[PDB]
Amino acid sequence: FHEAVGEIMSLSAATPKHLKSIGLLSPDFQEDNETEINFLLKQALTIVGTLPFTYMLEKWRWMVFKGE
Numbered sequence: 001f002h003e004a005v006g007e008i009m010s011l012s013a014a015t016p017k018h019l020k021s022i023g024l025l026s027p028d029f030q031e032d033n034e035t036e037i038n039f040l041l042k043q044a045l046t047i048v049g050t051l052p053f054t055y056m057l058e059k060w061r062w063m064v065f066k067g068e
């Protein structure tokens with residue numbers, strides 16, 4: 001829960017909608033469907049990248065500690 005609450009803020013803070021309202025991103029900047037794809041893939045390579053590895057490592061550790 002702690003890390004989830006810490007990460008939800010970072011997820012929203014990185015949106016171009018907030019950036020163009022905070023002044024760092026110029027208002028005359030329209031996000032394209034390709035930049036959205038690039039950002040989503042960059043996020044995915046971390047989020048969905050770390051999931052199967054985490055599950056497999058935990059399954060292996062649980063099966064080792066259980067003696068199977």
Ligand SMILES: [Zn+2]
Pocket residue numbers: 003006
């Ligand atoms: Zn933290």
